[PDB]
Design a protein around this ligand. Structure first.
Ligand SMILES: Nc1nc2c(ncn2[C@@H]2O[C@H](COP(=O)(O)OP(=O)(O)OP(=O)(O)O)[C@@H](O)[C@H]2O)c(=O)[nH]1
Ligand SMILES: [Mg+2]
Lengths: 13, 415, 165, 132
């Protein structure tokens, strides 16, 4: 997979 | 309720056969291929053939006809889902599925058809767990094959803790030749690649419309998931109560949810094609491709397949941007554009000859069908919001996501 | 590296002494409808033992081992006089063959805990072991619940397998 | 040919009878009447291997309608392998017991099936339930 990711948050309660 | 899972090939010889009940004779498979050739040479083809009182459910893979006979009032949805799960189990052991894998792995394929199905009732088909007591390289079967969490062997340990998502869209489209849009639906598929340590309990949270309406936020950007089909791993009762997606993930690649929503907004790539087909002389294609989507995102490698006549010859291609190859194996001009920015409009003009003596049979009119792929760009507007890692051990995992739009069957009917 | 059988009429305690030689216990065993095969490593010659039961539907199924067959043990049932006659007829059916020719005979006097049991001489005179040409036979008194006399019969058997020091 | 196959199948070393039974169920794969070699592969059944018992059980599963009177030389081995502490070999024995459609055999096989329907490890119970 040539593309790149983006971090998503963990808690968001 | 299958009776005898076969594996045929493209001639009618049995690569491997394995009967489960003995309620269908083993020499009934020799009656398959003449019945399929008879039913196909009169256009009455169906997946359910009939040799007297024995029904031939079958799917057709690359070289393989995975025929599975039955005799009673067989549960056909069960049989066909089992056949595609046999295809998926074989393709997760043997990275392609051809005749060159069935005649080499009879050590393990008879063990697999021994394991997957008993008496016609499929019972253990998750391949990542099935790789732990049926190997091509035996211990006790795992407690995963017993317990309710039947897709995740306990005690998996990684040094890092990464959760890779893929919210892959797939725009469908079917534009009729008058110029209006008939069926413009979007089939997303959040396809994870999990690497975690232990028995976690994720809680994926989308921007689902029913969740934003039960919360009270029904005026912001919310995707309207018309139907959502989850994996097994998602507990569906908790999803049905208050739209919470909680699941214990497998280890490896799988398809978490497969949503499907309609869209009454414009198509992404629009193909205004004309045809100057003079009879017996020539044909011309003043096809233009206007990119309706946003100015920021770049449609990587679009391939606007455009159906030429079957017997055209000696072409000419005046484009603006992007190469044209004429592919005569398929009778289409695969107009490739590598970087296709949103808002532009690239024009192409093919030009063929045509044979002066006319054809013998009519040909039909296949659709223009593009192959676009727009990364970092979700058409429906789904936004993953969080992914709560919950583990008794307790650690900080690293979730990730990326966004892709592709084609589904992005067809456009022609003149 | 020599193989050996255990045939005869059923309820003779033959799988009893089989797992006595194999493990060393008095095993609880159903009447052996099929067969049994394990091996015994003792005196550096592997005693691979092939029990076949004695039910009437499996009496004709003894010939299917008699290809590449090197030994023989007949296990008597001396506590049934009304069945030792048909056991003798079964034995004379089995020793009327041209395919079992190198296999020596080895009679085991089995279930030696009842006072009605005979010695190692009356059973021989009743079964007619002296009238067996080209047969190297030897009777042996073996008690199943104790396990005595088993390895001495196996020692005679190992004297029959190899003919060296 | 098949006689030398039987000669390898009446050996004392495991790595010739193992290739023998793999060659037998490769001959069964390509569509050969190897039905005449039935009571000689069943001597090579009671093995310490488990990757080999699956193949012999498979051969028993295909060739018991055609050798029905011969098939009574596996019942003691089924009730012998339905005591083993490994649950996989018990469930393999149980799903082999039902597939043999011989009317001289299923009368004998209700006792270990009765033993296994109440057995502990729930892999063999979920096999024995369908074996009923
Ligand atoms: N009292 C007493 N009974 C014995 C002795 N040895 C064997 N038996 C009896 O002999 C019977 C036969 O036991 P098995 O060995 O399991 O049966 P088998 O002799 O192999 O006969 P089949 O297996 O049916 O062909 C058992 O039920 C025992 O009760 C013994 O030393 N003393
Ligand atoms: Mg016995």
């Amino acid at each position: 997979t040539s593309y790149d990711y983006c971090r998503v948050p963990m808690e968001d309660g | 309720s299958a009776s005898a899972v076969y594996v045929l090939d493209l001639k009618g010889k049995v690569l491997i056969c394995r009967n489960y009940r003995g309620d269908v004779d083993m020499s009934e498979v020799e009656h398959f291929m003449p019945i399929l050739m008879e039913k196909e040479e009169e256009g009455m083809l169906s997946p359910i053939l009939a040799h007297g009182g024995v029904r031939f459910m079958w799917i057709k893979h690359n070289n393989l006809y995975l025929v599975a006979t039955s005799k009673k009032n067989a549960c056909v949805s069960l049989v066909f889902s089992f056949l595609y799960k046999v295809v998926q189990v074989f393709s997760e052991y043997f990275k392609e599925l051809e005749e060159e894998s069935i005649r080499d792995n009879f050590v393990i394929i008879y063990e697999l058809l021994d394991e997957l199905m008993d008496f016609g009732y499929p019972q253990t088909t998750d391949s990542k767990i099935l790789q732990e007591y049926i190997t091509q390289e035996a211990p006790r079967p795992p407690a995963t094959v017993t317990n309710a969490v039947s897709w995740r062997s306990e005690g998996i340990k990684y040094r890092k803790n990464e959760v890779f998502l893929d919210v892959i869209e797939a725009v469908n489209l079917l534009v009729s030749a008058n110029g209006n849009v008939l069926r413009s639906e979007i089939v997303g598929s959040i396809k994870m690649r999990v690497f975690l340590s232990g028995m976690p309990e994720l809680r994926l949270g989308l921007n689902d419309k029913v969740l934003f309406d039960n919360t009270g936020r029904g005026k912001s950007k919310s995707v309207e998931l018309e139907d959502v089909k989850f994996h097994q791993c998602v507990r569906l009762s908790r999803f049905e109560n208050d739209r919470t997606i909680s699941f214990i993930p497998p280890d490896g690649e799988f398809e978490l949810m497969s949503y499907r929503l309609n869209t009454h907004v414009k198509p992404l790539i629009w193909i205004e094609s004309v045809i100057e087909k003079h009879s017996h002389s020539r044909i011309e294609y003043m096809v233009k491709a206007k990119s309706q989507f946003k100015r920021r995102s770049t449609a990587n490698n679009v391939e606007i397949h455009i159906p030429v006549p079957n017997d055209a010859d000696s072409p000419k291609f005046k484009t603006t941007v992007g190469s044209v190859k004429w592919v005569p194996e398929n009778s289409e001009i695969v107009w490739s554009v590598k970087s296709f920015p949103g808002g532009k409009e690239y024009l192409m003009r093919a030009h063929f000859g045509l044979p002066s003596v006319e054809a013998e049979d009519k040909e039909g009119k296949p659709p223009i069908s593009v192959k676009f792929e727009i990364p970092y760009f979700t058409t429906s507007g789904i936004q993953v919001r969080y992914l709560k890692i919950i583990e008794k051990s307790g650690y900080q995992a690293l979730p990730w996501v990326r966004y892709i739009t592709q084609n589904g069957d992005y067809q456009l009917r022609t003149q | 590296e020599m193989r050996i059988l255990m045939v005869g009429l059923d309820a003779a305690g033959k799988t009893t002494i089989l797992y006595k030689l194999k493990l060393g216990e008095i095993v609880t065993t159903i009447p052996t409808i099929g067969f049994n095969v394990e091996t015994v490593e003792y005196k550096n010659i592997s005693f691979t033992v092939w029990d076949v039961g004695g039910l009437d539907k499996i009496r004709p199924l003894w010939r299917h081992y008699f290809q590449n067959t090197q030994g023989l043990i007949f296990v008597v049932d001396s506590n049934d006089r009304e069945r030792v006659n048909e056991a003798r007829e079964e034995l004379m059916r089995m020793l009327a063959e041209d395919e079992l020719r190198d296999a020596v005979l080895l009679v085991f006097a089995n279930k030696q805990d009842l006072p009605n049991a005979m010695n190692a001489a009356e059973i021989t005179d009743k079964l007619g072991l002296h009238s067996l040409r080209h047969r190297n036979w030897y009777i042996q008194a073996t008690c199943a619940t104790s396990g005595d006399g088993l390895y001495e019969g196996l020692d005679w058997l190992s004297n029959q397998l190899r003919n060296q020091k | 040919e098949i006689f030398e196959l039987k000669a390898e199948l009446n050996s004392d070393k495991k790595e010739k009878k193992k290739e023998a039974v793999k060659k037998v169920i490769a001959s069964m794969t390509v569509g050969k009447d190897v039905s005449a070699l039935f009571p000689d592969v069943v001597n090579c059944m009671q093995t310490d291997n488990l990757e080999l018992k699956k193949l012999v059980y498979l051969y028993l599963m295909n060739y018991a309608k055609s050798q029905p009177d011969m098939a009574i030389m596996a019942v003691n081995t089924f009730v012998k392998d339905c005591e083993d502490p490994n649950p996989l070999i018990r469930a393999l024995a149980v799903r082999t017991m039902g597939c043999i459609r011989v009317d001289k055999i299923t009368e004998y096989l209700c006792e270990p099936l009765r033993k296994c329907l109440k057995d502990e490890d729930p892999y063999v119970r979920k096999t024995a339930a369908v074996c009923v």
